[PDB]
């Protein structure tokens, strides 16, 4: 808004703003699919206990905030929600495919539309490091 149009800097910032919705979308997709993959690699009740403790702490903080302004069932529901992992094998294959595609897209966007050459490096290296889809491997190598 403050930048004067027709300027080079205005065009640069406009391009960065435009190619940022894709960055946010693919980063969120990759992050959530990575979380799913890591939690599915070994679904352990220790993670359930830790998440329940954190949710209880958040409940206590919210109650304290409500007090300043003037549990067990929810813990069990959250534990059940942890049991909402995809209990198949084609589903996790699709999730891994989505994660790899998100990494590839993020690397391509960083290299091309941002000229980063650093974040794209880790993106493509991590994509190549975890069983790529055999179609992205060679373009990512290039």
Ligand X SMILES: *[C@H]1O[C@H](CO)[C@@H](O)[C@H](O)[C@@H]1O
Q: What are the C-alpha distances in Å from 109 to residues 36, 37, 55? A: 24, 23, 36
Residues 4-33 that bind ligand X (CB under 6 A): 32
94 binds ligand X (CB under 6 A): yes
Cα–Cα distance for residue pair 85/75, rounded to 1 Å: 17
11 versus 91: smaller Cβ distance to ligand X: 91
Cα–Cα distance for residue pair 115/42, rounded to 1 Å: 37
Residue in 30, 52, 95, 124 binding ligand X, rule: CB under 6 A: 95
48 binds ligand X (CB under 6 A): no
106 versus 120: smaller Cβ distance to ligand X: 106
86 versus 138: smaller Cβ distance to ligand X: 86
Count CB atoms within 10 A of the CB of residue 106.
Answer: 24
End-to-end CA gap in the chain:
39
Residue in 19, 75, 79, 98 binding ligand X, rule: CB under 6 A: 98
Least distance from ligand X to the Cβ atom of residue 40, Å: 8
Least distance from ligand X to the Cβ atom of residue 103, Å: 15
Cα–Cα distance for residue pair 57/63, rounded to 1 Å: 10
Cα–Cα distance for residue pair 142/126, rounded to 1 Å: 15
- Which of 39, 41, 42 is CA-nearest to residue 31? 39
Residues 68-87 that bind ligand X (CB under 6 A): 82
Least distance from ligand X to the Cβ atom of residue 54, Å: 11
Contact residues toward ligand X (CB under 6 A) are 32, 35-36, 39, 82, 91, 94-95, 98
């Amino acid at each position: 808004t403050k930048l004067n149009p027709k300027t080079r800097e205005f065009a640069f910032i406009e391009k960065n703003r435009k190619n940022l919705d894709n960055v946010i979308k693919y980063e969120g997709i990759a992050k959530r699919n990575d979380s799913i993959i890591k939690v599915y690699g070994m679904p352990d009740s220790e993670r359930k206990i830790y998440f329940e403790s954190y949710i209880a702490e958040l409940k206590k903080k919210d109650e304290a905030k409500r007090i300043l302004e003037e549990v067990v069932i929810e813990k069990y529901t959250t534990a059940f929600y942890e049991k909402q992992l995809p209990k198949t094998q084609i589903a996790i294959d699709s999730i891994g495919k989505e994660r790899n595609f998100a990494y590839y897209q993020l690397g391509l966007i960083y290299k091309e539309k941002f000229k980063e050459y650093t974040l794209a490096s880790d993106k493509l290296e991590q994509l190549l490091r975890n069983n790529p889809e055999e179609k992205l491997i060679l373009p990512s190598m290039y």
